[PDB]
Amino acid sequence: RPAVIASIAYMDPGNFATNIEGGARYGYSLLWVILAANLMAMVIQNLSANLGIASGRNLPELIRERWPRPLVWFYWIQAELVAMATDLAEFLGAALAIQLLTGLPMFWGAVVTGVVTFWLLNLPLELAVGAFVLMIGVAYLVQVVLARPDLAAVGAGFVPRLQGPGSAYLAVGIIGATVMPHVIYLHSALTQGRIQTDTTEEKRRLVRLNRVDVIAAMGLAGLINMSMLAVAAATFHGKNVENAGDLTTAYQTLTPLLGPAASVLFAVALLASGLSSSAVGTMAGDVIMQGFMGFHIPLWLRRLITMLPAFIVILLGMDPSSVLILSQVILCFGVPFALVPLLLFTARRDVMGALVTRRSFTVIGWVIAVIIIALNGYLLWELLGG
Ligand SMILES: CCCCCCCC/C=C\CCCCCCCC(=O)OC[C@H](O)CO
Ligand SMILES: CCCCCCCC/C=C\CCCCCCCC(=O)OC[C@H](O)CO
């Protein structure tokens, strides 16, 4: 189902880095960020899936077929940058997990991950790979209960509070890792077909089934993300630990549960998430290219081009977790440019048919878009001026 692929993409190294760094640096105070981002992601993924089901065309294809040529050029370029950032995050996460597993430097780890992507790109194994991530998520769900978190701080973390200079930055990172624009584009394509009869009855059936699937998947994965942040908080926040929040250290979150094999299991799960999410990211990037332009560059060429930012970042000596969080921030910045056409098209009868979005949900989505735009503007204000 498309919800499985969306949940695979929602469990990427970017999500891992954001959850762990948020926990370690700010305690439970971003649980409300995670919850709100998960709700917005539910709404937006539902809107994109409904767009796909009702119109038969995905969001990039509709943009290309309905909007002026220069606007389509701009949209293709921005979506390509979004895909570059997403694949950078996921590929560098896979490389960092290879490093944690074997001991190789980041360069040769990225080389091994490139060989693995070459081996995979020949082609059902990504859901099996994702099962590792699902199991480490269950491990986190148990570790939350076992770690005995401070329920007072946990409850206080659900009240919306941006406290500190980098709090807005990390909340933007969480929102970008949860509401992924490449997945906003890809979800419409995942439900484009499989419709034997174009009737409104079957379209409504698909809409409801996909709604249930995506809500279940996003709810489970948001429970997992909140659990990861809570364990990271209870593990590194109050205690003064060096390099707290780095994914190299994050294995200590599951030490009281797994024991000596905690680091190996965390490295394996992060590699699994990196590979699966990178496959999903290359799929979404090819869908973006096709929908926006009409033609396609070779898949191996796109893979080799998307490896270039990863290898450049490795050569620059930049920190992997830091650049992952930055990539998720860039994704959050890219979110509104994808939300606007989605809302406009889902509020149109000539596009949706009898499945036009309810005006209440359209207003909710516009409120979400305004919130995200204001948060991105506030982050830009803090990062550039006073
Ligand atoms: C200061 C302004 C903030 C004021 C507060 C505004 C909050 C609105 C934002 C997020 C909640 C929206 C998500 C809650 C609804 C979730 C419904 C859902 O998940 O399903 C959607 C449905 O399937 C569609 O087709
Ligand atoms: C046992 C496996 C089932 C897992 C069930 C899902 C766990 C909760 C999920 C999300 C909330 C995470 C936010 C933290 C909420 C408070 C943490 C908590 O529940 O603590 C338990 C209690 O303190 C102990 O005595």
Numbering used by the authors: 45 to 167, 174 to 436
Quote the study on this structure.
Adding steric bulk along TM1a—for example a G45R mutation, which mimics a human anemia-causing mutation of a conserved glycine —prevented the opening of the extracellular vestibule and eliminated metal transport, emphasizing the importance of the alternating-access mechanism to DraNramp function. WT-like DraNramp (with the indicated reporter cysteine and a C382S mutation to remove the lone endogenous cysteine) maintains a dynamic conformational equilibrium—even in the absence of added metal substrate—such that either reporter can be fully modified by the thiol-specific N-ethylmaleimide (NEM) at high concentrations. G45R slightly increased A53C accessibility but fully protected A61C, indicating an outward-closed state that we will refer to as inward-locked based on these data and the structure described below. We have thus identified two complementary constructs that trap DraNramp in outward-locked (G223W) and inward-locked (G45R) states. Using lipidic cubic phase (LCP) to mimic the hydrophobic membrane environment, we crystallized and determined the structures of G45R and G223W to resolutions of 3.0 and 2.4 Å, respectively, both significantly improved from our earlier DraNramp structure (3.94 Å). Unexpectedly, the G45R structure is not in an inward-open conformation with our Fab-bound Patch mutant but instead adopts an inward-occluded, metal-free state that may represent an intermediate conformation between inward-open and outward-open states in the DraNramp transport cycle. The major exception is TM1a, which swings ~45° to partially seal the inward aqueous cavity in the G45R structure, a motion we previously showed to be essential to the transport cycle. The intracellular ends of TM4 and TM5 also move slightly compared to their position in the inward-open state, further sealing the metal-binding site from the cytosol. Comparisons of the G45R and G223W structures indicate that, rather than preventing inward motion of TM1a as we had hypothesized, the G45R mutation precludes TM4-TM5 from fully closing the inner gate, as any bulkier replacement for that absolutely-conserved glycine in our outward-open G223W structure would clash with E176 on TM5.
